[PDB]
């Protein structure tokens, strides 16, 4: 009834103000942290979204459950980006930066209720983060013998660790050893698209395997296909991208010709055309002929005839990773073709794996890169099997680089709490409210995993703080037995760069809600 | 599968969060009106109504609520003007804070089974510890008990100005109306006084009328509106024409008769008149009617009349007055007796002037000298609010004059509580420590909630609050630190026994007891069925 | 029954509004640019909060800076647009100071109705407010202290960058100051015009603000196309035609008229690119970045040479990369390159924050151009440091302009506040009054520093005039905790864009007269 | 509340979310189970030898009778 003017303020919109627009911000935190609170710990369980068009989508990643939501708040918009951007730096700093922001912002609602204006709380905040990020460098464990089989046995069990909490409960043993050999065997680039991950409907976790080549998909191929035998001990691959069919037309030559004595030569022109790049494949010992570009009825029965392998239509992420597997390099034109541009491998066949056909290559040494074949009993289920394959890998591609490991559990969150709440005790001001509350915020990453499966944890927290404040400072939340345990002995770890940028990017989230107190949403929506 | 109930079903610790959320809907919107420093509201109709008022009961009990949990709160502010008067806008913002971090405890896999049985041991400690921390009764401070105390409820209303113009008039009020009862107990209704509203000159003009103000009217412009030395005669029955009952007819066979019935009707009325008349009686109250016949015996003789009067005000003029309420004739197969030696006594009944309306006024009454308030103010919106101040301001003087014991006021006894309490969870506590842990928190939002009306320091003045409590608790030296307040006007802590900051015991020992009552109730929703509204079939 | 009023005179219109007198338009014009002065008073000064406005694309923006609050509020108001674009000649003419102006023509506006509800008309209060403004530019060089002469390095522009990057990023002053000292003095033309241009933001998601650096050179979003990434000697040829040959401009057709001719076509062409990317093979080049597309022949010879390719779709991208390498774009195809040659030090990839970069870094020859690299947990964030981050660039083309500063924080408007009012009293006319409000719109400008802290404003702004007693002049405002106590800013070193405060006042009392010379509002029917 | 807040601003989340669907409850484990139970049930008549055979249609209206699983689920 009050704003009544002749011209209004801009069109139609509505602004919050003060302190009931934080609560709004901090409270609207809160129920987007439930999507990512029950997904933490190896109790966790998974979470199922299915959009408007019906594909459905089972998942327990943050950033995959996060943008299924279609969340338009501008404030629980924050959270969904963290989640972003530890799967673009780290790749298993998801569901529990999500969950740690939010209880930054819980931790002062009865703080931000009463008083105390927001710049206190930033200059808190950054001060307990740049604090806590330097406790976890001056304690992470490294070794000074590298390159040998300890550096390994280093690398399986982070990556056991990060198979956990995933859709695999027995296969940790099996999965996580091939993720090691899958980054050891790439070059010193670690790039991600040298390794491909192609899902075979049917079959068991155990019928998955790890092929030190590459297999492409079989796709659309003429008649001569089931004719060409896939047995070959010693073959060389030649990779092209030219047209091995009849039609190859630059659409724009106009043969214009005089007389029918001339005609027919220009026609036994075009057979002699197609046929002289396939004498460029022949006499050189290239038997598997691999292009992008497809390859006519014409071509196809000439390879046959000369026991000969090929395969058209391949894709251009596949010819890559050929590329790098048999030491060769892909021409374009046929006529430069020699030894040096041929590949070399061992075994290549066509087998019938889950039904639909793959022809993989096998024994060439010189591999720079690899491919994992998975094999499930559902398209949502590889997909999760995909998901969880890439947190691995993304873990032990930035162990490689560093090799400082912390705790896994929450063995280095306790710690910190422990670590923090001694130095709030030793600074006077409103900042023993602020240090001390956010020591007590990071005690939630040994509650979910504990409040996922029952465990008494208002029991276990006690018995955290007295082992931490007595003894090790790697002592955590065992799973099997509902009592604490040393996680550093019992082989639970995880990259020290895992939790830095987690608690970076849970700061920096934290001190951006609070620091908003104005929210104006233009009506304009179409 | 599932139940087939045609409503809805909400399970799980949903409800268990919608419950918190209604009940902080309800304290974040009384948090602005609590304490010196808050602020009154406006309660605007559908139909065009404004009320501007800042209690807790008035605000809630006009506001519409749907939630369960959400009428909770709403009717435990009712209860409180029954109970106590003024204690209804903290026991709301206390109940729902109870709510809340209740809440944060069963979010930590805690049973509510030990926070309802937490909530006991901290609750009944809670009045054993305030009624063992005193500081005295109403024999030394005197009348200056009886001011400071009726000053600190008017700080948060209309009333507060830094005089002592309205906390002198209900002292003064309460006193005039000490009505004695059996086995020594000196009862103080607060109820026989007339509190009236008139749109006239400022607040300082508000006049204190020892006696009885009726709000009506003489009637026929033909009487004295002022009476010196006059006799009350209430009484209760129409003074209008006989008129038969459904039983008796008129059923006449001579037509001379026919006369003799229709002057009856009259002359039966006037002989009551003339009897009643005769006595000395000049001032006639009448809860019926007077019709205009009768109204002419009055003009003639010399006498007041004032016609429907209400029951309850008639009620107050006769036992002050010493008047008996008659509504027929009685004494032993009487014909017209009237028990003339039973009239009431009146100093001056005059009818004054009170801005275009008509008041009669009782000086004195000369049997028991009651007291009436008349109010003045702007508009017709100040004159709700002032009278719902002056109600509660009464309803304070009435429990301290009862029960002789006050508690320093401005949250001293929520400083006091939040530290005995968290040493009481530390002795006793293995498994309900933290439901005592977490209800001397729950008692810190009452100074906190003064902090933040008033624009100062938040977490710095309720530390600085409690570090005084601290060390009167822990260091037995005489500190005598148990009346630090707050002082909103400055920010900083002070001393309550001297500053006159006065609130009864059972202000907050009531209050403490209904919001803890109400707390485990709104505990108990872990499973919600709501049903279809069953309307049109 | 119920009779009602007719037009009268000139009702003419279809649908359309009019305002007339000093009610209906001079006070309605003041009391909406009121709302937009109050709007952003708390986003003012250090202690400013942020404010998430969407716009109507339905995308967050979420900043403190109100140069780029106004430009996503769809304001329909006339007068209200008028304080928007002077606020928005700010930003174009020093790009600091677009907030001083809101609250600056919002206390003049606001100053301007206690004066004509009081006294004089518009004739004499814009009038009034010309001869202060006038005397309000003798004062500001007489309040210069310091001078940004002394030292042009990466020492001296680390502290005097402080004041433009604290008031929008309060905790990351240190780390932002050394970021913009590092690419600012960096690309400096050696006593020339110092072009903001040449300072480029490459937003990469990932960790947070201490892992941000500059990097002397570009830094693209694109890839190779090739297995050449590894170049060290980085003689790079740059194109703007498509890499895929020469073709004809009219319509093109081949022409065949023999066998011999459709036979000798596919392979004289493989032959003539062969020949173009074999001629700058010989010349030594290692880097080839085209603008348009690349066919496969292309790409067949660029791997067989060892030479690597890169693809610019952008053709604004493509001229700041001649002035990285010292190169220049030729529109033909591939001749053998004489002298227009580019001159790195080292071009490679790395895939940092799951985005495969390509970097052309410069490691001896350190200042030809720069770019900010910035890192952030949010889209959101990134955002507003590179608002801080152009606020460092804009600031240190002032200090190219002129290198006099003044001492802010409050201590300019306080000096602005007691001269004007040593002017007011001197002068023997009825025009005095808007002088002597001319010199309090100067006082609500340190209040908005200490209601945004927390501080009671009261107390604040009467310790400023008790220690101005004709002598100080530098004493601005303490905001690091309750009770200030107030210090000295040259101690401090708060003190920042001495033409930024001479073109704000000037601009905002150009807009506040503006307003007050509309007395007749004509509309149109918004459609 | 949902939709609302306790200080009286609209609570909007995600988009659309009057009509949604979320259970997390109890139930949901147990609206698994009756979901994959009828699909057993079904399929249980359908097995051995004395297996007897489902009658299906298409959307085009064609009928194909069918005692396989992988069809019969198709
Ligand atoms: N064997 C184990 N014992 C106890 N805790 C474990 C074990 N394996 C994993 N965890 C815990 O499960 C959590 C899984 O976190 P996760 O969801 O992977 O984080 P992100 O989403 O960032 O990848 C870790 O914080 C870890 O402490
Ligand atoms: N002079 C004062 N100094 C400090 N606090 C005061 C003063 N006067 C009143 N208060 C506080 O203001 C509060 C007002 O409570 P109130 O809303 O009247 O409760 P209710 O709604 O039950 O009547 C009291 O709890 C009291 O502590
Ligand atoms: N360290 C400091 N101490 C006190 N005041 C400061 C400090 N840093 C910045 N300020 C104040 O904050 C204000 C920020 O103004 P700003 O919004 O940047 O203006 P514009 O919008 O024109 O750029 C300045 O007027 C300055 O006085
Ligand atoms: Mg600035």
């Given at each position: 009834?009050?704003?009544?003017?002749?011209?209004?303020?801009?069109?139609?919109?509505?602004?919050?103000?003060?302190?009931?627009?934080?609560?709004?911000?901090?409270?609207?935190?809160?129920?987007?942290?439930?999507?990512?609170?029950?997904?933490?710990?190896?109790?966790?369980?998974?979470?199922?979204?299915?959009?408007?068009?019906?594909?459905?989508?089972?998942?327990?990643?943050?950033?995959?459950?996060?943008?299924?939501?279609?969340?338009?708040?501008?404030?629980?918009?924050?959270?969904?980006?963290?989640?972003?951007?530890?799967?673009?730096?780290?790749?298993?700093?998801?569901?529990?930066?999500?969950?740690?922001?939010?209880?930054?912002?819980?931790?002062?609602?009865?703080?931000?209720?009463?008083?105390?204006?927001?710049?206190?709380?930033?200059?808190?905040?950054?001060?307990?983060?740049?604090?806590?990020?330097?406790?976890?460098?001056?304690?992470?464990?490294?070794?000074?013998?590298?390159?040998?089989?300890?550096?390994?046995?280093?690398?399986?069990?982070?990556?056991?660790?990060?198979?956990?909490?995933?859709?695999?409960?027995?296969?940790?043993?099996?999965?996580?050893?091939?993720?090691?050999?899958?980054?050891?065997?790439?070059?010193?680039?670690?790039?991600?698209?040298?390794?491909?991950?192609?899902?075979?409907?049917?079959?068991?976790?155990?019928?998955?395997?790890?092929?030190?080549?590459?297999?492409?998909?079989?796709?659309?191929?003429?008649?001569?296909?089931?004719?060409?035998?896939?047995?070959?001990?010693?073959?060389?691959?030649?990779?092209?991208?030219?047209?091995?069919?009849?039609?190859?037309?630059?659409?724009?030559?106009?043969?214009?010709?005089?007389?029918?004595?001339?005609?027919?030569?220009?026609?036994?022109?075009?057979?002699?055309?197609?046929?002289?790049?396939?004498?460029?494949?022949?006499?050189?010992?290239?038997?598997?002929?691999?292009?992008?570009?497809?390859?006519?009825?014409?071509?196809?029965?000439?390879?046959?005839?000369?026991?000969?392998?090929?395969?058209?239509?391949?894709?251009?992420?596949?010819?890559?990773?050929?590329?790098?597997?048999?030491?060769?390099?892909?021409?374009?034109?046929?006529?430069?073709?020699?030894?040096?541009?041929?590949?070399?491998?061992?075994?290549?066949?066509?087998?019938?794996?889950?039904?639909?056909?793959?022809?993989?290559?096998?024994?060439?040494?010189?591999?720079?890169?690899?491919?994992?074949?998975?094999?499930?009993?559902?398209?949502?289920?590889?997909?999760?099997?995909?998901?969880?394959?890439?947190?691995?890998?993304?873990?032990?591609?930035?162990?490689?680089?560093?090799?400082?490991?912390?705790?896994?559990?929450?063995?280095?969150?306790?710690?910190?709490?422990?670590?923090?709440?001694?130095?709030?005790?030793?600074?006077?001001?409103?900042?023993?409210?602020?240090?001390?509350?956010?020591?007590?915020?990071?005690?939630?990453?040994?509650?979910?995993?504990?409040?996922?499966?029952?465990?008494?944890?208002?029991?276990?927290?006690?018995?955290?703080?007295?082992?931490?404040?007595?003894?090790?400072?790697?002592?955590?939340?065992?799973?099997?037995?509902?009592?604490?345990?040393?996680?550093?002995?019992?082989?639970?770890?995880?990259?020290?760069?895992?939790?830095?940028?987690?608690?970076?990017?849970?700061?920096?989230?934290?001190?951006?809600?609070?620091?908003?107190?104005?929210?104006?949403?233009?009506?304009?929506?179409? | 599968?599932?139940?087939?109930?045609?409503?809805?079903?909400?399970?799980?610790?949903?409800?268990?969060?919608?419950?918190?959320?209604?009940?902080?809907?309800?304290?974040?919107?009384?948090?602005?009106?609590?304490?010196?420093?808050?602020?009154?509201?406006?309660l605007?109709d559908?139909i065009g109504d404004v009320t501007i008022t800042?209690d807790?009961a008035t605000?809630?009990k006009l506001?519409?609520?749907?939630?369960?949990?959400?009428?909770?709160?709403?009717e435990?502010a009712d209860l409180q003007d029954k109970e106590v008067g003024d204690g209804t806008?903290?026991?709301?913002?206390?109940?729902?804070?109870?709510?809340?971090?209740?809440?944060?405890?069963?979010?930590?896999?805690?049973?509510?089974?030990?926070?309802?049985?937490?909530?006991?041991?901290?609750?009944?400690?809670?009045?054993?510890?305030?009624?063992?921390?005193?500081?005295?009764?109403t024999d030394?401070?005197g009348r200056?008990c009886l001011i400071?105390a009726a000053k600190?409820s008017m700080?948060?209303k209309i009333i507060?100005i830094?005089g002592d113009f309205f906390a002198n008039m209900v002292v003064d009020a309460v006193l005039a109306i000490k009505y004695t009862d059996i086995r020594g107990q000196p009862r103080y209704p607060v109820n026989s006084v007339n509190i009236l509203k008139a749109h006239g000159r400022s607040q300082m003009e508000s006049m204190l009328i020892s006696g009885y103000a009726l709000n009506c009217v003489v009637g026929s412009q033909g009487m004295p509106k002022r009476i010196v030395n006059a006799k009350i005669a209430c009484l209760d029955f129409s003074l209008q024409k006989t008129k038969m009952k459904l039983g008796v007819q008129v059923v006449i066979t001579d037509p001379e008769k026919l006369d003799q019935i229709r002057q009856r009707e009259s002359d039966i009325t006037k002989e009551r008149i003339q009897k009643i008349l005769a006595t000395g009686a000049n001032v006639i109250l009448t809860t019926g009617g007077i019709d205009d016949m009768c109204l002419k015996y009055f003009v003639e003789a010399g006498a007041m009349a004032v016609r429907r009067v209400l029951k309850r005000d008639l009620k107050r003029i006769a036992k002050a007055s010493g008047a008996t309420i008659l509504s027929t004739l009685a004494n032993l197969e009487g014909e017209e007796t009237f028990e003339a030696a039973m009239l009431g006594q009146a100093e001056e009944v005059v009818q004054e002037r009170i801005c275009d309306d008509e008041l009669i006024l009782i000086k004195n009454t000369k049997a028991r000298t009651s007291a009436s308030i008349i109010l003045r103010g702007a508009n017709d919106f100040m004159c709700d609010e002032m009278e719902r101040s002056l109600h509660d301001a009464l309803c304070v003087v009435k429990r301290v004059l009862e029960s002789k014991?006050?508690?320093?006021?401005?949250?001293?006894?929520?400083?006091?509580?939040?530290?005995?309490?968290?040493?009481?969870?530390?002795?006793?506590?293995?498994?309900?420590?933290?439901?005592?842990?977490?209800?001397?928190?729950?008692?810190?939002?009452?100074?906190?909630?003064?902090?933040?009306?008033?624009?100062?320091?938040?977490?710095?003045?309720?530390?600085?609050?409690?570090?005084?409590?601290?060390?009167?608790?822990?260091?037995?030296?005489?500190?005598?630190?148990?009346?630090?307040?707050?002082?909103?006007?400055?920010?900083?802590?002070?001393?309550?026994?001297?500053?006159?900051?006065?609130?009864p015991?059972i202000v907050?020992?009531k209050?403490?007891?209904?919001?803890?009552?109400?707390?485990?109730?709104?505990?108990?929703?872990?499973?919600?069925?709501?049903?279809?509204?069953?309307?049109?079939? | 029954?119920?009779?009602?009023?007719?037009?009268?005179?000139?009702?003419?219109?279809?649908?359309?509004?009019?305002?007339?007198?000093?009610?209906?338009?001079?006070?309605?014009?003041?009391?909406?640019?009121?709302?937009?002065?109050?709007?952003?008073?708390?986003?003012?000064?250090?202690?400013?909060?942020?404010?998430?406005?969407?716009?109507?694309?339905?995308?967050?923006?979420?900043?403190?800076?109100?140069?780029?609050?106004?430009?996503?509020?769809?304001?329909?108001?006339?007068?209200?647009?008028?304080?928007?674009?002077?606020?928005?000649?700010?930003?174009?003419?020093?790009?600091?100071?677009?907030?001083?102006?809101?609250?600056?023509?919002?206390?003049?506006?606001?100053?301007?109705?206690?004066?004509?509800?009081?006294?004089?008309?518009?004739?004499?209060?814009?009038?009034?407010?010309?001869?202060?403004?006038?005397?309000?530019?003798?004062?500001?060089?007489?309040?210069?202290?310091?001078?940004?002469?002394?030292?042009?390095?990466?020492?001296?522009?680390?502290?005097?960058?402080?004041?433009?990057?604290?008031?929008?990023?309060?905790?990351?002053?240190?780390?932002?100051?050394?970021?913009?000292?590092?690419?600012?003095?960096?690309?400096?033309?050696?006593?020339?015009?110092?072009?903001?241009?040449?300072?480029?933001?490459?937003?990469?998601?990932?960790?947070?603000?201490?892992?941000?650096?500059?990097?002397?050179?570009?830094?693209?979003?694109?890839?190779?196309?090739?297995?050449?990434?590894?170049?060290?000697?980085?003689?790079?040829?740059?194109?703007?035609?498509?890499?895929?040959?020469?073709?004809?401009?009219?319509?093109?057709?081949?022409?065949?008229?023999?066998?011999?001719?459709?036979?000798?076509?596919?392979?004289?062409?493989?032959?003539?690119?062969?020949?173009?990317?074999?001629?700058?093979?010989?010349?030594?080049?290692?880097?080839?970045?085209?603008?348009?597309?690349?066919?496969?022949?292309?790409?067949?010879?660029?791997?067989?040479?060892?030479?690597?390719?890169?693809?610019?779709?952008?053709?604004?991208?493509?001229?700041?990369?001649?002035?990285?390498?010292?190169?220049?774009?030729?529109?033909?195809?591939?001749?053998?390159?004489?002298?227009?040659?580019?001159?790195?030090?080292?071009?490679?990839?790395?895939?940092?924050?799951?985005?495969?970069?390509?970097?052309?870094?410069?490691?001896?020859?350190?200042?030809?151009?720069?770019?900010?690299?910035?890192?952030?947990?949010?889209?959101?964030?990134?955002?507003?440091?590179?608002?801080?981050?152009?606020?460092?660039?804009?600031?240190?083309?002032?200090?190219?302009?002129?290198?006099?500063?003044?001492?802010?924080?409050?201590?300019?408007?306080?000096?602005?506040?007691?001269?004007?009012?040593?002017?007011?009293?001197?002068?023997?006319?009825?025009?005095?009054?808007?002088?002597?409000?001319?010199?309090?719109?100067?006082?609500?400008?340190?209040?908005?520093?200490?209601?945004?802290?927390?501080?009671?404003?009261?107390?604040?702004?009467?310790?400023?005039?008790?220690?101005?007693?004709?002598?100080?002049?530098?004493?601005?405002?303490?905001?690091?905790?309750?009770?200030?106590?107030?210090?000295?800013?040259?101690?401090?070193?708060?003190?920042?864009?001495?033409?930024?405060?001479?073109?704000?006042?000037?601009?905002?009392?150009?807009?506040?007269?503006?307003?007050?010379?509309?007395?007749?509002?004509?509309?149109?029917?918004?459609? | 509340?949902?939709?609302?807040?306790?200080?009286?601003?609209?609570?909007?989340?995600?988009?659309?979310?009057?009509?949604?669907?979320?259970?997390?409850?109890?139930?949901?484990?147990?609206?698994?189970?009756?979901?994959?139970?009828?699909?057993?049930?079904?399929?249980?008549?359908?097995?051995?030898?004395?297996?007897?055979?489902?009658?299906?249609?298409?959307?085009?209206?064609?009928?194909?009778?069918?005692?396989?699983?992988?069809?019969?689920?198709?």
């Amino acid at each position: 009834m009050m704003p009544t003017p002749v011209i209004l303020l801009k069109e139609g919109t509505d602004s919050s103000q003060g302190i009931p627009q934080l609560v709004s911000n901090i409270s609207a935190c809160q129920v987007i942290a439930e999507a990512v609170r029950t997904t933490l710990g190896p109790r966790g369980m998974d979470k199922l979204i299915v959009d408007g068009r019906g594909k459905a989508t089972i998942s327990n990643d943050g950033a995959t459950i996060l943008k299924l939501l279609d969340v338009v708040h501008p404030a629980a918009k924050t959270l969904v980006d963290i989640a972003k951007s530890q799967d673009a730096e780290v790749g298993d700093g998801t569901t529990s930066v999500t969950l740690l922001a939010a209880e930054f912002l819980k931790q002062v609602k009865p703080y931000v209720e009463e008083g105390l204006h927001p710049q206190i709380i930033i200059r808190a905040f950054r001060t307990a983060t740049q604090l806590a990020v330097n406790k976890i460098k001056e304690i992470a464990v490294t070794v000074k013998k590298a390159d040998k089989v300890e550096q390994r046995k280093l690398l399986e069990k982070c990556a056991m660790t990060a198979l956990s909490s995933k859709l695999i409960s027995q296969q940790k043993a099996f999965f996580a050893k091939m993720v090691v050999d899958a980054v050891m065997m790439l070059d010193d680039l670690l790039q991600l698209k040298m390794i491909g991950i192609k899902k075979v409907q049917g079959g068991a976790l155990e019928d998955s395997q790890l092929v030190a080549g590459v297999a492409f998909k079989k796709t659309f191929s003429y008649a001569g296909f089931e004719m060409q035998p896939k047995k070959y001990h010693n073959p060389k691959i030649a990779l092209l991208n030219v047209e091995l069919e009849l039609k190859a037309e630059k659409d724009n030559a106009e043969i214009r010709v005089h007389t029918v004595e001339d005609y027919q030569a220009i026609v036994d022109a075009e057979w002699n055309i197609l046929y002289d790049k396939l004498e460029k494949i022949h006499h050189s010992g290239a038997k598997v002929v691999s292009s992008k570009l497809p390859i006519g009825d014409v071509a196809t029965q000439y390879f046959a005839d000369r026991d000969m392998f090929c395969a058209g239509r391949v894709p251009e992420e596949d010819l890559k990773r050929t590329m790098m597997a048999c030491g060769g390099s892909i021409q374009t034109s046929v006529n430069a073709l020699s030894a040096d541009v041929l590949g070399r491998c061992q075994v290549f066949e066509e087998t019938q794996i889950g039904g639909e056909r793959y022809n993989f290559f096998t024994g060439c040494p010189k591999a720079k890169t690899c491919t994992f074949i998975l094999r499930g009993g559902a398209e949502q289920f590889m997909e999760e099997t995909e998901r969880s394959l890439h947190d691995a890998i993304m873990i032990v591609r930035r162990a490689i680089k560093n090799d400082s490991v912390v705790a896994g559990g929450g063995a280095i969150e306790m710690e910190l709490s422990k670590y923090l709440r001694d130095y709030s005790r030793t600074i006077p001001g409103k900042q023993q409210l602020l240090i001390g509350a956010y020591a007590k915020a990071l005690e939630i990453i040994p509650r979910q995993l504990c409040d996922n499966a029952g465990f008494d944890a208002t029991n276990i927290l006690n018995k955290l703080r007295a082992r931490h404040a007595q003894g090790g400072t790697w002592y955590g939340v065992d799973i099997n037995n509902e009592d604490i345990a040393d996680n550093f002995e019992a082989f639970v770890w995880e990259p020290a760069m895992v939790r830095i940028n987690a608690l970076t990017a849970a700061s920096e989230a934290a001190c951006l809600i609070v620091s908003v107190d104005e929210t104006i949403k233009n009506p304009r929506s179409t | 599968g599932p139940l087939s109930v045609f409503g809805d079903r909400s399970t799980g610790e949903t409800i268990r969060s919608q419950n918190v959320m209604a009940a902080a809907s309800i304290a974040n919107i009384v948090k602005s009106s609590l304490g010196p420093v808050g602020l009154d509201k406006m309660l605007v109709d559908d139909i065009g109504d404004v009320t501007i008022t800042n209690d807790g009961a008035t605000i809630l009990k006009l506001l519409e609520v749907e939630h369960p949990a959400a009428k909770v709160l709403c009717e435990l502010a009712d209860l409180q003007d029954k109970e106590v008067g003024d204690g209804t806008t903290s026991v709301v913002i206390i109940a729902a804070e109870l709510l809340k971090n209740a809440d944060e405890l069963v979010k930590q896999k805690i049973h509510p089974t030990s926070v309802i049985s937490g909530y006991r041991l901290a609750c009944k400690e809670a009045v054993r510890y305030i009624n063992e921390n005193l500081i005295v009764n109403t024999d030394e401070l005197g009348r200056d008990c009886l001011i400071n105390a009726a000053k600190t409820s008017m700080s948060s209303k209309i009333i507060g100005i830094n005089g002592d113009f309205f906390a002198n008039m209900v002292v003064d009020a309460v006193l005039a109306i000490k009505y004695t009862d059996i086995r020594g107990q000196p009862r103080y209704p607060v109820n026989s006084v007339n509190i009236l509203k008139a749109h006239g000159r400022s607040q300082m003009e508000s006049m204190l009328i020892s006696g009885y103000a009726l709000n009506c009217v003489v009637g026929s412009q033909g009487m004295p509106k002022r009476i010196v030395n006059a006799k009350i005669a209430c009484l209760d029955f129409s003074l209008q024409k006989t008129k038969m009952k459904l039983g008796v007819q008129v059923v006449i066979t001579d037509p001379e008769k026919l006369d003799q019935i229709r002057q009856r009707e009259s002359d039966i009325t006037k002989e009551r008149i003339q009897k009643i008349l005769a006595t000395g009686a000049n001032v006639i109250l009448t809860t019926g009617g007077i019709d205009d016949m009768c109204l002419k015996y009055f003009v003639e003789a010399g006498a007041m009349a004032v016609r429907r009067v209400l029951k309850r005000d008639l009620k107050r003029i006769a036992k002050a007055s010493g008047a008996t309420i008659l509504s027929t004739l009685a004494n032993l197969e009487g014909e017209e007796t009237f028990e003339a030696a039973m009239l009431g006594q009146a100093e001056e009944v005059v009818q004054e002037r009170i801005c275009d309306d008509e008041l009669i006024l009782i000086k004195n009454t000369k049997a028991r000298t009651s007291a009436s308030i008349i109010l003045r103010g702007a508009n017709d919106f100040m004159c709700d609010e002032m009278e719902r101040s002056l109600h509660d301001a009464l309803c304070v003087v009435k429990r301290v004059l009862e029960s002789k014991s006050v508690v320093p006021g401005g949250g001293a006894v929520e400083a006091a509580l939040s530290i005995y309490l968290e040493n009481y969870a530390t002795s006793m506590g293995s498994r309900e420590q933290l439901a005592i842990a977490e209800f001397a928190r729950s008692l810190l939002v009452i100074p906190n909630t003064l902090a933040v009306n008033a624009a100062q320091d938040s977490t710095d003045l309720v530390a600085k609050l409690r570090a005084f409590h601290n060390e009167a608790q822990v260091n037995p030296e005489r500190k005598n630190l148990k009346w630090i307040g707050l002082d909103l006007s400055n920010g900083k802590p002070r001393d309550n026994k001297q500053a006159g900051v006065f609130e009864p015991t059972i202000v907050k020992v009531k209050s403490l007891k209904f919001a803890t009552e109400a707390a485990i109730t709104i505990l108990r929703i872990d499973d919600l069925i709501k049903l279809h509204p069953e309307s049109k079939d | 029954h119920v009779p009602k009023a007719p037009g009268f005179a000139q009702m003419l219109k279809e649908g359309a509004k009019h305002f007339s007198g000093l009610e209906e338009a001079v006070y309605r014009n003041i009391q909406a640019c009121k709302e937009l002065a109050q709007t952003t008073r708390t986003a003012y000064g250090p202690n400013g909060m942020n404010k998430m406005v969407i716009n109507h694309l339905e995308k967050l923006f979420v900043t403190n800076d109100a140069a780029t609050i106004l430009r996503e509020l769809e304001v329909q108001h006339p007068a209200a647009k008028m304080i928007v674009m002077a606020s928005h000649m700010q930003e174009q003419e020093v790009g600091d100071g677009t907030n001083f102006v809101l609250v600056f023509a919002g206390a003049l506006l606001e100053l301007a109705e206690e004066l004509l509800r009081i006294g004089l008309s518009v004739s004499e209060v814009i009038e009034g407010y010309e001869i202060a403004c006038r005397k309000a530019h003798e004062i500001l060089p007489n309040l210069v202290c310091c001078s940004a002469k002394n030292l042009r390095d990466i020492d001296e522009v680390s502290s005097l960058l402080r004041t433009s990057i604290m008031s929008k990023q309060y905790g990351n002053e240190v780390f932002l100051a050394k970021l913009i000292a590092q690419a600012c003095v960096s690309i400096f033309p050696d006593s020339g015009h110092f072009n903001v241009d040449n300072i480029r933001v490459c937003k990469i998601l990932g960790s947070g603000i201490s892992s941000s650096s500059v990097l002397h050179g570009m830094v693209f979003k694109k890839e190779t196309e090739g297995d050449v990434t590894s170049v060290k000697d980085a003689k790079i040829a740059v194109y703007s035609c498509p890499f895929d040959g020469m073709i004809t401009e009219t319509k093109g057709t081949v022409l065949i008229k023999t066998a011999e001719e459709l036979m000798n076509f596919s392979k004289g062409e493989e032959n003539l690119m062969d020949a173009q990317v074999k001629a700058i093979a010989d010349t030594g080049a290692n880097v080839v970045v085209t603008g348009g597309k690349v066919a496969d022949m292309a790409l067949h010879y660029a791997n067989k040479y060892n030479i690597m390719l890169v693809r610019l779709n952008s053709k604004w991208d493509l001229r700041r990369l001649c002035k990285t390498v010292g190169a220049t774009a030729l529109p033909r195809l591939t001749p053998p390159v004489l002298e227009e040659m580019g001159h790195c030090d080292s071009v490679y990839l790395s895939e940092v924050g799951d985005t495969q970069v390509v970097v052309f870094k410069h490691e001896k020859e350190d200042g030809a151009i720069s770019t900010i690299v910035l890192r952030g947990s949010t889209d959101n964030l990134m955002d507003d440091i590179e608002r801080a981050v152009d606020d460092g660039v804009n600031t240190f083309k002032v200090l190219t302009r002129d290198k006099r500063l003044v001492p802010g924080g409050g201590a300019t408007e306080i000096e602005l506040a007691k001269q004007i009012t040593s002017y007011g009293e001197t002068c023997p006319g009825l025009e005095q009054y808007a002088i002597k409000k001319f010199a309090e719109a100067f006082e609500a400008i340190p209040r908005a520093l200490a209601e945004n802290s927390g501080v009671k404003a009261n107390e604040v702004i009467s310790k400023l005039y008790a220690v101005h007693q004709e002598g100080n002049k530098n004493v601005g405002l303490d905001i690091e905790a309750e009770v200030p106590a107030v210090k000295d800013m040259l101690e401090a070193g708060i003190l920042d864009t001495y033409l930024g405060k001479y073109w704000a006042i000037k601009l905002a009392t150009n807009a506040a007269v503006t307003v007050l010379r509309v007395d007749q509002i004509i509309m149109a029917k918004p459609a | 509340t949902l939709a609302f807040d306790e200080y009286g601003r609209p609570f909007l989340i995600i988009k659309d979310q009057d009509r949604k669907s979320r259970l997390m409850g109890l139930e949901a484990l147990k609206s698994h189970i009756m979901a994959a139970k009828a699909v057993a049930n079904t399929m249980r008549t359908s097995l051995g030898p004395n297996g007897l055979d489902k009658m299906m249609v298409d959307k085009d209206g064609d009928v194909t009778v069918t005692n396989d699983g992988a069809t019969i689920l198709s």
